Amino acid sequence: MRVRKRQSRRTSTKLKEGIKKKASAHRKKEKKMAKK
Amino acid sequence: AKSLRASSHLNAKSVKRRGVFQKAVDAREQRISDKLKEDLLKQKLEDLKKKE
Amino acid sequence: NGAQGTKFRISLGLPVGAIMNCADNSGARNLYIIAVKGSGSRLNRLPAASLGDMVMATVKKGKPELRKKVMPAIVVRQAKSWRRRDGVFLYFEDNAGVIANPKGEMKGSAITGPVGKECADLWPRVASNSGVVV
Amino acid sequence: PQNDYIERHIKQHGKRLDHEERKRKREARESHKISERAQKLTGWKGKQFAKKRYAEKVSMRKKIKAHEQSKVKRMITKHTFVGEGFTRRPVKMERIIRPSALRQKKANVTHPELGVTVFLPILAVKKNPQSPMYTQLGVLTKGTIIEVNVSELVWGKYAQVTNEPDRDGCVNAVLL
């Protein structure tokens, strides 16, 4: 068959570093939500 | 419409090809090879024209 | 609908926007083509009819009874050089067509002038209302 | 085609020779094919299958548990309300454009003490938090206290809004 497009496993540097910022954002939320 | 490579039409045409459809070609081939065998003898007579 | 047996290719002489004469004694004298039923599809190509093809056509010069309604029309005279299987190329004097229902049954009682051989073969009831064939 | 053309055909000729073998083996295959679908079906079909299968589990929990229990026994882009004296009202609202699409007249109000929702027209916008401009514009952001018409009809005349009508469709309020 016509073999469809494969997703990449190369994580671009913008993605990888943006992943770190989103992670640390989830921390700051979790520390605040722990107090209530 | 059924394609050129439609499986059922290829199988129906294979039902054809085991019948009359090949037998006529296998008679024509014998008539062609016969006249080919006839073409040796004429040239062999023209060999014997010079051999005379 | 209506056409008897297979239909083979003859040259196309009557596109959309062509005025042909009317041949039956129904009342109409001429016919204006608007669409051709059972035609091919290119980009920018107009639908072109030929002899013995049912077109959708309007009356332009005729009786008011035959007007007010767009109706099927089978072309009986072509005047463009088509080919027969018996050697010859032929053409007529003018473009003419006859009006009928979608079933292929004729409204008129007689068709004037020659009717094409191919058209009379394909449509049986046209050959029933024919005076002259070929 | 008369009335029961296949039921009479069953009651005279039967289903098939193998109709019971095909059915029984298929129902026995379905225990596998549920699991064969759950580990295949990539994409949206997997998400829809998971939601339907979770539903088919909670419903079964309800059947079994109920059986066990029965065993014992500048323009504004926010939604506003404008009073019926609109024709020449803005003395102090020089160029404060409020389009007619964003004007919702009937708030979908629920009653607290009796769990019935009465879809009634708004009479007056009273106290919008966040902005005292918005009180004078009639903006219906979350927390706004509004006046409710009780023409259709113990009742409380005021209701506090609970949704964000900029996001969803209607205005949803709870009486005080």
Binding site: - | - | - | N3, T77, L102, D166, R167, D168
Partner: protein, 421 residues
């Protein structure tokens, strides 16, 4: 429209209906937008989706409303027949709920598009779109009962018989399981059970037959003892331009007293008083003459085991319903036998020739061997038709040898004269 309704688009059970319309708006519309686009393209995206789902539900609802027959506008027989088979009020309640729901969905779509041209973020716009299609879903979830009813009515009206109230009809009546099932069994091709209990038949079975070159339809009935099955029979008697064939069992069979048939005949008498009744028998004999006291009645005695009197009942029924120089023939044709299709001993036609020779479109018919000649050795005709610029058929006549010799005389009359020097 007319007599029957099989051609109705199917009715989805309100949960699947949602799964059709909402999935189609996910597949047919574009689905991917960034938050980083212009606000105009974000607006137009979600507007296109709310509207498309709007048209989706409306298309499915319109198919139901136009599909089902407008009960009180069709025909008095059908208006009442559907009223007997289905709760007519509920049939109008259900279709009213669909007509209500379509206008609701239209209102929702027109609302949220108007509300959508003021969205400031992708989130707000998304919340408004989800609000719209979710609201439509809630409306369709409120339709789980009437659509479940509408599927069952669609299936059962799709299988209903087509009676024509304008063709020559004849009702077949009597007590349930008299033997009238055997009558329609032996008059036409319609499979009706003669099972030995009361209500075997549950609806109006129809049988067509032809007599005196005309289309007739005899309508079998379940019978009268009130029920939906029972009232179906009575309204068929009342509204059809017909004659009624009340059947009686003058025997131990049926399991009902003949006097109860007398009581029922004289009780139902008012509504078949206008229809010119025929009565067929399949102190005591005197109470058959009590039945004869009706203005328009006739009594006939018949047996269904024999095939002559069953036909004679039909003959009298149809008769009641109507009132309500020399040619040239060759002796080779006259002496010739008829063509019996199931005869082992006859001539083989060309149809059987082409089968024996194999195939329809593969066999070439020999035009030769079928035409008459002096010598059948020259049957395989060649016939040149053209020789050197001039066609043979124009030169072709009988006595061309004698005509040539006449031209040979015309040779020698110019040979000695001296034209060739």
């Amino acid at each position: 429209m007319q007599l029957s309704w099989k051609d109705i688009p199917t009715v989805a059970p309100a949960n699947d209906l949602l799964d059709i319309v909402l999935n189609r708006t996910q597949r047919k519309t574009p689905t991917v937008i960034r938050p980083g686009f212009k606000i105009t393209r974000i607006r137009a995206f979600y507007m296109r989706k709310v509207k498309y789902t709007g048209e989706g539900f409306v298309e499915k609802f319109e198919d139901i409303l136009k599909g089902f027959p407008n009960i009180n506008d069709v025909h008095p027989f059908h208006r009442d027949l559907m009223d007997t088979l289905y709760e007519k009020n509920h049939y109008k309640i259900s279709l009213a709920a669909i007509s209500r729901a379509k206008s609701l969905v239209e209102q929702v779509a027109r609302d949220y598009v108007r509300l959508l041209k003021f969205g400031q973020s992708l989130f707000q716009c998304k919340q408004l779109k989800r609000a719209a299609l979710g609201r439509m879903a809630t409306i369709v979830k409120k339709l789980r009962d009437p659509l479940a009813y509408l599927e069952q009515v669609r299936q059962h009206i799709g299988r209903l018989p087509s009676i024509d109230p304008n063709t020559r009809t004849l009702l077949i009546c009597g007590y349930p399981n008299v033997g009238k099932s055997s009558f329609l069994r032996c008059i036409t091709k319609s499979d009706v059970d003669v099972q030995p209990y009361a209500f075997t038949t549950k609806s109006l079975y129809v049988g067509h037959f032809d007599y005196k070159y005309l289309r007739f339809q005899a309508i079998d009935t379940p019978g009268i003892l009130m029920n939906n099955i029972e009232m179906q029979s009575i309204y068929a008697i009342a509204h059809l331009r017909s004659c009624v064939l009340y059947f009686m069992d003058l025997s131990e069979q049926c399991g009902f007293t003949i006097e109860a048939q007398v009581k029922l005949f004289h009780s139902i008498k008012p509504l078949f008083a206008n229809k010119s009744v025929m009565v067929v028998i399949n102190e005591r004999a005197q109470l058959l003459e009590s039945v004869k006291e009706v203005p328009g009645v006739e009594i006939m005695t018949s047996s269904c085991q024999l095939e002559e009197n069953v036909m004679e009942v039909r003959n009298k029924a149809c008769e009641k319903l109507l009132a309500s120089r020399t040619p040239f023939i060759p002796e080779s044709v006259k002496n010739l036998k008829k063509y019996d299709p199931e005869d082992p001993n006859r001539r083989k036609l060309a149809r059987d020739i082409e089968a024996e020779n194999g195939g329809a479109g593969v066999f070439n018919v020999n035009l030769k061997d079928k035409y008459l000649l002096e010598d059948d050795e020259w049957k395989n005709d060649i016939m040149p038709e053209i020789l050197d610029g001039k066609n043979v058929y124009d030169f072709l006549d009988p006595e061309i040898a004698a005509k040539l010799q006449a031209l040979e005389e015309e040779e020698e009359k110019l040979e000695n004269e001296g034209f060739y020097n």
